[PDB]
Design an enzyme around this catalytic site. Structure first.
Site: not given
Ligand SMILES: Cc1cc(-c2cnn3c(NCCN4CCOCC4)cc(Oc4ccccc4)nc23)ccc1C(=O)NC1CC1
Length: 260
Positions: A16-17, A20, A22, A24, A38, A132
């Site tokens: 989903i993400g 660099g 890394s 997710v 992550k 940011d």
């Molecule tokens: C980067 C990160 C990401 C999640 C997370 C937890 N869920 N989630 C989701 N939800 C699901 C989205 N989708 C997918 C397809 O459709 C169905 C559902 C999207 C997402 O998109 C993103 C992805 C990257 C950046 C922003 C947003 N990031 C996350 C939690 C923690 C961290 C993180 O490293 N934090 C730092 C430690 C402090």
């Protein structure tokens, strides 16, 4: 594929993400409970990157108790080669949810604003200024917005300079305070209100940065029913951070405290 963390084994649904070194992943545990993991590859990481990841994990850990508007950290595993963090998975990130909705219920926007102030205020109390913030940093889960990160380690993006504050530009060449986050939050609310970011329609980065610092460039606010909102936007988007509204004030504001 699969991932193991402190014994427990998890199955990758999708990625989903990314960032660099890394990634997710949305994943499932054995009981088919969903989580975000992550993974950080540390193999060519400098000490500064190493330390920034160590500082994130520590802050994420400490802040668990202080707000449920901060992403939940259930478990992690860190060695010299890798990090794995098991955290809660949300429904959607706010930056995606904004491009799909394109007309936001005033109630939902107000409730989301509170969520953001509270999350961000929480990190301010532990001496962090994110610096940011943008909608990607926020995540919808249940009916509420949670803060995903603290601006401490490398930013990831979902599988962008509208939000930068004047102090940060004039900084070169610290003027960064908690007010800097208010500006960026200002911009995010502006977007949820007017459907664009204050300096969005400006064309090429380099000009937009001058606008952002330039008093004479009057930033414009269309009149709208909610005047509480209108005032909030104005107060967040003041260029002089000493006169910019603060988060403790924002939380005392009629827009947040007074409904209908
Ligand atoms: C980067 C990160 C990401 C999640 C997370 C937890 N869920 N989630 C989701 N939800 C699901 C989205 N989708 C997918 C397809 O459709 C169905 C559902 C999207 C997402 O998109 C993103 C992805 C990257 C950046 C922003 C947003 N990031 C996350 C939690 C923690 C961290 C993180 O490293 N934090 C730092 C430690 C402090």
């Amino acid at each position: 594929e699969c991932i193991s963390v402190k014994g427990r084994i998890y199955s990758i649904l999708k990625q989903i993400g990314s960032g660099g070194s890394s990634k997710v992943f949305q994943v499932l545990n054995e009981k088919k409970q969903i989580y975000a993991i992550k993974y950080v590859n540390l193999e060519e990481a400098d000490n500064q990157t190493l330390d920034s990841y160590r500082n994130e994990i520590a802050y994420l850990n400490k802040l668990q108790q202080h707000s449920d508007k901060i992403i939940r950290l259930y478990d992690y595993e860190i060695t010299d080669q890798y990090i794995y963090m098991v955290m809660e998975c949300g429904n959607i990130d706010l930056n995606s949810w904004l491009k799909k909705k394109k007309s936001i219920d005033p109630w939902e926007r107000k409730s989301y604003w509170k969520n953001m102030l509270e999350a961000v205020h929480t990190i301010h109390q532990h001496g962090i200024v994110h610096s940011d913030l943008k909608p990607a940093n926020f995540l919808i889960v249940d009916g509420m917005l949670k803060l995903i990160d603290f601006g401490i380690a490398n930013q990831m993006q979902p599988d962008t300079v509208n939000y930068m504050p004047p102090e940060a530009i004039k900084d070169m060449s610290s003027k960064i305070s908690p007010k800097s986050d208010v500006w960026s939050l200002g911009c995010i609310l502006y977007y949820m209100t007017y459907g664009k970011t204050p300096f969005q329609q400006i064309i090429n980065q380099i000009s937009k940065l001058h606008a952002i610092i330039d008093p004479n460039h009057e930033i414009e606010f269309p009149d709208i029913p909610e005047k509480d909102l209108q005032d909030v936007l104005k107060c967040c988007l003041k260029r002089d951070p000493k006169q910019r509204i603060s988060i403790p004030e924002l939380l005392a504001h009629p827009y947040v405290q007074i409904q209908t």
